[PDB]
Amino acid sequence: IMTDAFQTAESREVTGAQGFAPTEGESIVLSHNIQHQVALPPDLDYEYIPLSEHKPPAEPARTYSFKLDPFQALSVASIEREESVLVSAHTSAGKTVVAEYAIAQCLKKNQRVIYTSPIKALSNQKYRDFQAEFGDVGLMTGDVTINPTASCLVMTTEILRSMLYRGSEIMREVAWVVFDEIHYMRDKIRGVVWEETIILLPDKVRYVFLSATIPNAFQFAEWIAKIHRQACHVVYTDFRPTPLQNYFFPAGGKGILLIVDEKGNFKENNFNQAMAMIEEKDEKADIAKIIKMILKKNFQPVIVFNFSKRECEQMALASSSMKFNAPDEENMVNKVFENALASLSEDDKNLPQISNILPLLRKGIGVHHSGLLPILKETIEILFQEGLIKVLFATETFSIGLNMPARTVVFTQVTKWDGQQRRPLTSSEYIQMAGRAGRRGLDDRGIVIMMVDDKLEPETARAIVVGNQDKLNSAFHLGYNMVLNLLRIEAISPEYMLERCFFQFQNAASVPQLERELISLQQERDAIIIPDESIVKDYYGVRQQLEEYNKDMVFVIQHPQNCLGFFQEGRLIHIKSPSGVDYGWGVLIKHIQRQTPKNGQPPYPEQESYVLDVLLKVSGDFNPKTRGEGPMPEGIMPAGKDSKNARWEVVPCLLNCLRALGQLRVFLPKRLESADEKDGVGKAVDEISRRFPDGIPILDPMENMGINDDSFKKLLRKIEVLESRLVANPLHNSPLLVELWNQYSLKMQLGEQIKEKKKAIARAHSVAQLDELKSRKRVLRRLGFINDAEVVQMKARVACEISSTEGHELLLAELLFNRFFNELSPEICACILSCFIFDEKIETQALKEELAKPFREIQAQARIIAKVSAESKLDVNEDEYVQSLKWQLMETVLAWAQGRPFSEICKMTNVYEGSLIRLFRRLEELLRQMAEAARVMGSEELKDKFELSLSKIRRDIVSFNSLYL
């Protein structure tokens, strides 16, 4: 708390006047701040430092009749004065309009532009958008290259890189290059591609950067300014048209809690109370409940984000039990659904995927992911922004596309990708996805709901929504195709790129500042002075030690190896929920082992296996006698209504709710049914309390229950001696430990925060990239790809022709050069190259020895390569690399090459009809890429081999992007 303000909560007007000059504050408040900063090109000599101001005028000299808000104005103005610019804002800011200005500006003076997009599917959309607008546009994908002689070009990031490494002449003719959604350079796989593209580009090329909101945007321009010697502007804004309230939805919980206020206030108790729900662990039914009521709570439309393509369709299946569409909306969706039918064959219109989605869309439930037909996903995109879909289940890729907002965003998962890590959801991803909430005009507030499963790290749950944003990190890492292409051309070495990679620029610029971060952090923990600094350390230190180790005691006790033999009807029992809430004493009614669950959930661990029916005095929502697999039926102990209820009630408690056993048992009848029968036993319990004021005697875990374990005696003895240390401090006669604990907490926090900052500098000076290159260039010398002088050889020249596939640039180069594909057939050559093309899992069973023989050999070749590569001081396991190829699609593609109908094709495998298109067109491009590879090898017979194979992969409906010119 430093300098801040607070909005007028709901609606207010602060001023008024009459007749002459008013002050208009009509229906909008409060979105304010904008930013403009400029990075500068490094100076060559001491002799001259020019001070070059570039502060662009708000409104441009010529707007080309384009419509512009004040924010997009100076973004445009920077391009008008011909200088690089970074546009960092939410998708609501309408950034796409400045890309259309850049193109129009060039076309006006008639020069060439290159537009790029993170995904090829969005490139096709932007193409027909640009083409219908300008007309001088043509797209160059891998698969389809249309109108390359056109001024403006829309292309894949993969293609743009391939032209630079090959030194295409068109790059001499390119003025501006527009990157869109550039913040996805973060991607640990394809993020390196964006850097390779940027670094290799001519220094006199002007850039346009379209990105989401990032903190370090100026640092990015600094990196562009230094390596390209340019002056790069930065236009950044944090404003969004609609406020946002954040609700947390606990797993198994019966409601949502507001964690973040619309003004930004963070409720800590609602946060804490939410965490109390999650220590009680199926939950997939909870989304079905949420979506149901938010319909009645009038939260629509709602975008539900799920990172898996499969269960994304399941949550729509469970939501298919509801109908959100009106009769006029009911037939309007299939009247606009029939337009895409003319664009498809009659056989393709009966496709299984489409026939299932059709009734679903009629109910107003959408599904969006990469496994859908590009025409089908587009209609779903159309229906949404036309308002004919009130519920959408989408993946992360949906947040990348054009602005299509909703009233509500629901996070089903908070964990993310497989690539290399299980990551909690970073702040940058949160803002991008949650930004879809809160439509500008028709919404008062954005509604964000999150489903939270808990583990040992709750701080993860806080920092995401509550904390700051994250830096834009470079994913740059070495690769075989890149180092060979760099070692190929004389003028440049692979070390040259390592110098100019954004990762290097970060670390270099990070370390001097990161040092001050440490020394300031070291000051505070020293500035904090606690009286008797030691005693508190050995107090709280042993506090977390005993409170933790006693949980290990009850865990051994709760296990049926010990407690079970002491289960007798009427035995007094002490029940305390796993959350730590104490339901008080009780009396054992009945014990039963749970046998044979339905199916789904993995069988019970013997700790939670048994279910104990136990008499307790607690109340609440009374029934759940059909008991959820949670610890107890959702009840409430005598902290609630002690008048509305005090009833001794048999409670089906799970075995983990038992924390202690009683000394003596109460005689019990056969039946406790009515309220009378149970209440009598309660007075029988209360009578025992009347005779035992200090407490009710406990069965000693060691001697009474006969637990002699060496590990148990150990733990139990380390419990005693640890307790004695707690007695030697000022625990008694004064509890001022609060001020001590509050003060001491920061000392450990800062100490831990220092430990992070300390080891942070070690990773700034990390040599990993450099040492990898030396270790990587050894396999290039050993496998025969280069010489002892580390100069390119013939095999390495065909490896520079392989792009679409990253593992096997060497393998394919090895196999092809070793005379392999020539002994095959064109269709066979295509079905073999299928193993390399995409990593998505597929289930079919074909060990057909005909395709198993070439597979096993090229699979063994992978082991051969990985064998020497591993002892070349790299890290890849002999088994892991080998399994990276898929035989499960080999049968499918071979049938397509023989000209079999698409409908039967998808019957062989469980592959998505949409995903099958993607890996095929990519396969089509591996063919087009290897066709040139054989052309360099000197063997022109293998070129036709890849061409004759290519001709059978090309038809009308499998070539689907746009057809114009």
Distances (CA, A) of 527 to 331, 532, 750, 965: 71, 15, 11, 71
CA atoms within 13 A on the CB side of 62: 9
The sheet with strand 112-117 has its strands ordered as 35-38, 233-236, 85-88, 206-211, 174-180, 112-117, 152-156, 137-140
Nearest to 357 by CA among 395, 304, 312, 399: 312
578 and 632 Cβ atoms separated by less than 8 Å: no
Determine which helix (DSSP H) or strand (DSSP E) holds 115, and give its type and residue range.
strand 112-117
CA distance 529 to 935: 75
CA distance 874 to 888: 29
Cα–chain-centroid distance for residue 299? 24
Query: Is 95 part of any known ligand binding site?
Result: yes
CA distance 766 to 957: 50
Distances (CA, A) of 269 to 252, 260, 266, 274, 577: 19, 11, 9, 8, 20
3-state secondary structure 558-595: HCCCCCHHHCCCCEEEEEECCCCCEEEEEEEEEEEECC
Tell me the helix, strand and coil percentages in the chain, rounded to 5.
45, 15, 45
Rounded to 5 degrees, φ, ψ at 342 are -70, -25
Total Cβ atoms within 10 A of residue 466: 15
Q: How many residues does the chain have?
A: 965
Q: Are strands 35-38 and 233-236 parallel, antiparallel or unpaired?
A: antiparallel
Secondary structure class of 685 (helix, strand, coil) = helix
H-type helices in 838-940, by residue range?
849-870, 878-882, 890-897, 902-908, 913-937
CA distance 178 to 939: 39
Rounded to 5 degrees, φ, ψ at 552 are -75, -25
DSSP state of 603: P
The sheet with strand 257-260 has its strands ordered as 257-260, 244-250, 446-452, 408-411, 302-305, 391-394, 365-368
Packing angle of the helix pair 285-296, 310-318 (nearest 10 deg): 50
CA distance 888 to 249: 40
Q: Are strands 649-654 and 610-616 parallel, antiparallel or unpaired?
A: antiparallel
Secondary structure class of 440 (helix, strand, coil) = coil
Q: Are strands 365-368 and 610-616 parallel, antiparallel or unpaired?
A: unpaired
Torsion of CA 641, 647, 648, 654, to 10 degrees: -50
Total Cβ atoms within 10 A of residue 291: 26
Query: Is 69 part of any known ligand binding site?
Result: yes
- 97 token code pair: 């309009």
Residue 103 region by backbone torsions, left for phi larger than 0, else alpha for psi between -120 and 50, else beta? alpha
DSSP state of 116: E
CA distance 73 to 79: 10
Question: Amino acid letter at 632?
Answer: M
439-462 burial: b if 16+ Cβ within 10 Å, else e: beeebeebbbbbbbebeeeeebbe
CA distance 459 to 160: 41
What are the binding residues? 69, 95-96, 403
Binding residue positions for ADP = 69, 95-96, 403
